[PDB]
Ligand binder design. Sequence first.
Ligand SMILES: CCCCCCCCCCCCCCCCCC(=O)OC[C@H](COP(=O)([O-])OC[C@H](O)COP(=O)([O-])OC[C@H](COC(=O)CCCCCCCCCCCCCCCCC)OC(=O)CCCCCCCCCCCCCCCCC)OC(=O)CCCCCCCCCCCCCCCCC
Ligand SMILES: CCCCCCCCCCCCCCCCCC(=O)OC[C@H](COP(=O)(O)OCCN)OC(=O)CCCCCCCCCCCCCCCCC
Lengths: 105, 140, 120, 97, 347, 171, 98, 167, 80, 48
Amino acid sequence: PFFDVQKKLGVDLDHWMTIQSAEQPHRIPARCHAFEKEWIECAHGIGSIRAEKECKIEFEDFRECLLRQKTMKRLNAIKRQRDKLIKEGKYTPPPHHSGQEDLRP
Amino acid sequence: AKTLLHQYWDIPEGTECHRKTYAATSIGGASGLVVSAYSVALKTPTSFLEGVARTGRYTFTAAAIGAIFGLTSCISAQVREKPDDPLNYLIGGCAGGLTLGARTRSYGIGAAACAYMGLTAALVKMGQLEGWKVFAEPKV
Amino acid sequence: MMTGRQARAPLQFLPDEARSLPPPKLTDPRLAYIGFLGYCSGLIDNAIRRRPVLSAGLHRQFLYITSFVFVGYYLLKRQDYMYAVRDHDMFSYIKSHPEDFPEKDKKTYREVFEEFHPVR
Amino acid sequence: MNLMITLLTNFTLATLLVTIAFWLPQLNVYLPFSMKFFLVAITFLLFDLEIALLLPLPWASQTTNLNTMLTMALLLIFLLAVSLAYEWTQKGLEWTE
Amino acid sequence: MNPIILIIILMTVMLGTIIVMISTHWLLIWIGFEMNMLAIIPIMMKKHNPRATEASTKYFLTQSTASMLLMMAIIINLMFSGQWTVMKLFNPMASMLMTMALAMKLGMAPFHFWVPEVTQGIPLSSGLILLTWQKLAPMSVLYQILPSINLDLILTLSILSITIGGWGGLNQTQLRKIMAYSSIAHMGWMTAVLLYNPTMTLLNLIIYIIMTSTMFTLFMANSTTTTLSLSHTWNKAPIMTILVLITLLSMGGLPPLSGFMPKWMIIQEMTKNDSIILPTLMAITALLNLYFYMRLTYSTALTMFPSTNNMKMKWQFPTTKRMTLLPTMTVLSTMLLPLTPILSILE
Amino acid sequence: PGIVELPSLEDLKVQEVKVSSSVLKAAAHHYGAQCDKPNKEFMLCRWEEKDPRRCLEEGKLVNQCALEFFRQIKRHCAEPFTEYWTCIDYSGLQLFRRCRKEQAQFDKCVLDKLGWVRPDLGELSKVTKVKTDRPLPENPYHSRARPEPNPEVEGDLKPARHGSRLFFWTM
Amino acid sequence: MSLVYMNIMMAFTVSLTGLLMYRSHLMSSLLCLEGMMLSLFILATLMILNSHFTLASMMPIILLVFAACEAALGLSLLVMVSNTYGTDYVQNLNLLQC
Amino acid sequence: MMTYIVFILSIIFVMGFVGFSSKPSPIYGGLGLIVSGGVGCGIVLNFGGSFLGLMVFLIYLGGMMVVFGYTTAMATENKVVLGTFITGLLMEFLMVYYVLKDKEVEIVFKFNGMGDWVIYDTGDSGFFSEEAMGIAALYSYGTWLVIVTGWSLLIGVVVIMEITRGN
Amino acid sequence: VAAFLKNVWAKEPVLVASFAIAGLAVILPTLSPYTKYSLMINRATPYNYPVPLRDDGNMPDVPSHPQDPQGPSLEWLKRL
Amino acid sequence: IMKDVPGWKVGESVFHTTRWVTPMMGELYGLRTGEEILSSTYGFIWYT
Ligand SMILES: CCCCCCCCCCCCCCCCCC(=O)OC[C@H](COP(=O)([O-])OC[C@H](O)COP(=O)([O-])OC[C@H](COC(=O)CCCCCCCCCCCCCCCCC)OC(=O)CCCCCCCCCCCCCCCCC)OC(=O)CCCCCCCCCCCCCCCCC
Ligand SMILES: CCCCCCCCCCCCCCCCCC(=O)OC[C@H](COP(=O)(O)OCCN)OC(=O)CCCCCCCCCCCCCCCCC
């Protein structure tokens, strides 16, 4: 029994804090605003059973925005191979990845 | 412990007796550890030695039930050459019931556990054959 | 099951499409049974307070009957509405999915072979 | 970072002065429970939670929903006052008033 | 307690449950549970004796633990979904933690261990609130999260509640512990049908609330908290023995009574989903519940136990207790089976 | 998934505005007045494309129009501007209100020698309109096709055939 | 996921096992319960600050306030228990076995 | 080492929880929860939550744990504790050793072993703290939340005065 | 209504001052002519960037430059 | 760097969408020194 009093009376008791893509103070975006907007607009109205299978791409992009697991795994792989090549001596870091280039602006 | 039941049921009946006996022994040992865990939980033993004695007693009791069950079921499937037959698990469940009576040192508990555990193991074999579901997935 | 059906317009006891349906008659035997339950509640109310059961508080017995008939009429309206919604959804789903509901070829018993089992 | 250095310096100076004060004169040879105190501590805790609700007000006055903000600010301070008035009239603030 | 303060506190219990039922945000669900627990603690300490303080402490510890597990499930859901909508959960760990938390709030086995203690420690009216109104908010949360509820967990909880609530009531002579183990078994029946058809969950909840409110109202009307004080009722109010007879036969699920209505419909929904062993063993296990209900009917209505001499004084005084809705509840708890297809109003 | 497409290091070379933030804050109001059009073209492109890689050339125009802003200060009014941003630069919060007479001398010299009027309070915060030749991005979120909705309910609601059909009830 | 979440969840499970394994005092149970609350506060806060989810920034405060009110209620129950037996030992709270 | 500062504070946080959850005495348990609240505030401050961390100091430590230690001082005046403490400490440092030697671990969830600076945002918020603005929006957008919280606090006052009276 | 107020002012002037200050806090913002200017000053404060509009061709009220006449003005705030 | 690694696509996005994603802190400063990392990730928080 989800008695939907908020939709029945037209009052917004708690829909405003429910998602990150809702109206925020000073129009501050969430970091995953575009991914959450894509996943919500994909999965809207088609029901949860169809949304599990038909919006999997947007939901996987949004979960990977939220937790950055694939990104951190890729950075792990790059940094580990870099440390292995530094230990083997088969690589040297450039001057712009050592701190000798006096950044852009 | 769902993979314990899977490595029990993956082997055909009457083919590899030692590994079926070991798998049923491990299922019985896991059930005995669960019973021992709640037993020393809800009823505090008087010492640590009494607690590990109760744990070892219940674990070895249920593991011996499982061992003699799997052994008797696989031997009855071998000597009758009928692997898909619930009478084999009826004999195995009665052997496990006689084991549970031998651990409790009483004949009446042995005969009662023979009858009820043999009928239960027969029903489990029939459910594996005809595909009976206890935790059935919602379909409609 | 049908909870997404009544979720676009929530908390409606009887929606506007329920008025397309014929209402229960006032001589509905279900409604007469609910009135009988009100009469039984009035008798138990006299019995537990040690009033004379058939005679005392006829106004109270009549308000029991009236209140049960009043609530039960709307409960029967909602019941008939929900079974009508059930059948409307069933028929619209069968009409929209013909590949899932084919017309089965009905065979007469001259072609149908059934095994005979003698009782002897 | 400067704050962590400052906290470490204050903690180090305090521990050094305490270590001096406990080990410089070593050179020389030489209750029944009171319900009233518990009630004032719990009244502190409840009004302190109400204060925690009141703490974003200097930022909340910057909103464009000022009628709603002013209504809710006055309602929170009013409910703190109703908590005090209930604590008063039911003899909760007595013998430590 | 001041009657105004009692009204405000009971409205706050109701408000917490209503906030749980109407909110779309998980924080407001959690707030509704916190508000409900905070308001229901004085209802349990209404009479100020050490058994009520012990019951309120045990209730506080179990419900606070469940509330923290609920908030951890909400927080894990926020990790793996970035949102707060009260709908399916987006992690099986959060689903498990929320199902455990709601089972603790319901007192379903093996988290059942507070329900007979807390029900015994508190008055009959507050145990009426605990066994009927306090089930409403966690069942509504279970209603909304059922696309993510693990089947094996909820059915394990269901059968474990039905078996433990059946065996627990067999040993009892106190009426509040009998109603508590009866509660545990009926909540097992409600969660067993939940993933298959939650309309039958609502049906079992409503029929259980009617029958349990009837039995608590009879116990309050006769001032009986034990089997043996309930056995004096025939020599004082013989109509009350007939009412406890028909209501206890209904709670056993014997047709043609109304408490046959849920379990039958539950079996009717569990065999459509090809589960045959499970409603069979559930119905056979409910015979334990019927056995201790029959024990109470033997002691109260079907035999006449010996009374005392001072009972003759109580013959001269009528029951001035407000037996609120007791004839209506007694009729609805017994004669409702011919109106079994009314259940579609819960869809 | 696909390979991310980054612009080269040659495509990111531009003549930088190598002045400090106090210089920028001192020149800010006349910069928002004089360099309005390529700045608003860039920010319109930046909020419509939602991608910095699609906004580089307009951004270079910003970095082209700022420098022409400062050279025209350096050719005419270098000393009142220097005296003004030094006074801005002293402050920790870089207050405008501590520096009103140096601001008045800078605004006097700029209004005389260049004709630039400093914007009033409220003007640089206006939402303006921008005439662009680039097309509107038809899919800036790069969204794929949305799933087709479920069929709605339609038709007249007839009564249930033979009632509830619950086991033996005829209604 | 990120490395601090492991430790905040492990802190929650440590305070959970502390609250699920009593020693003697009811106060130690209430301390483990509020440790569970503290870890929920920290975990909620790190998520909400990482996500830049602005409106949920008021959520942990609410989580603090309610739970401290809950804690106040717990202390009061403890005090009434301690006004019966002299201590707050959980083994004195066993009258409801029969 | 300094890129791992939130991780180090989280290690000290778990060590403090193993400290009080082993339950030596409720006063030392209070001290352990105080030290844990301080280092958890430090974690929150290092994700940029200045106001929420100061709420941990003002309300959790300065408000609630004060009342806990107060009630404990009014109510109060081993081998299991030490073994439990070293057990939790060894479990935590085995977690540390695994996630540092592997840069990945999986207890229940998968966890990266890099420094947790990597997940942060690379922009600015202009002339506001976003966390301060979201907390300030409790009065503009959080009307129902203000209502239910203030009503629960008023009811909490009433409930404490009911159950502590004994009449 | 007049003897009661003098009685409570003689006995409890702290509470009389408390209820008077709280009543002036409640009723006076609805009676102030400057309450509108609080809202106007809060909405006139530019925290965000004023993201410009694509000139479709027909927007006479939207300026092309900050120093254009059309658009929202803050002369009321400079003058008051 | 990633030449010896088999099956490695250099510059492969972890997202299925081809929309621009705002770069993470470890994506920009991952290969740089610890001083630049510490500055860009805790400089404003640790500033005074
Ligand atoms: C132009 C404008 C004006 C037009 C006016 C036209 C009418 C003029 C006459 C006015 C009166 C009309 C009455 C309603 C029509 C007849 C209804 C009927 O009999 O349905 C047959 C119904 C089905 O038979 P049918 O041959 O297929 O249909 C014939 C008609 O077409 C039936 O029509 P249907 O197909 O539409 O029926 C619909 C459906 C047909 O039924 C079904 O679809 C099957 C399911 C039925 C329910 C089965 C429940 C099983 C478990 C519970 C068992 C209860 C325990 C037994 C009773 C214990 C003692 C109280 O009925 C229901 O769903 C309602 C549920 C059953 C209630 C029946 C009405 C009772 C009203 C009076 C209540 C008084 C107390 C009665 C006893 C309490 C229990 C009912 O019969 C049964 O199920 C057997 C039980 C008999 C029912 C009660 C008989 C009513 C008259 C009783 C008067 C004497 C009372 C004595 C004092 C109180 C008792 C101590
Ligand atoms: C509507 C505006 C907002 C109102 C809510 C916000 C209030 C802000 C201030 C916070 C106050 C919270 C606590 C109030 C407690 C009131 C109850 C009380 O104090 O009653 C007891 C007192 C007698 O004192 P006693 O019990 O003896 O204590 C020992 C000292 N003699 O009894 C008394 O002294 C009687 C006190 C009540 C009468 C005071 C009348 C003052 C009128 C001022 C002018 C009108 C102001 C407009 C508002 C209407 C006020 C009625």
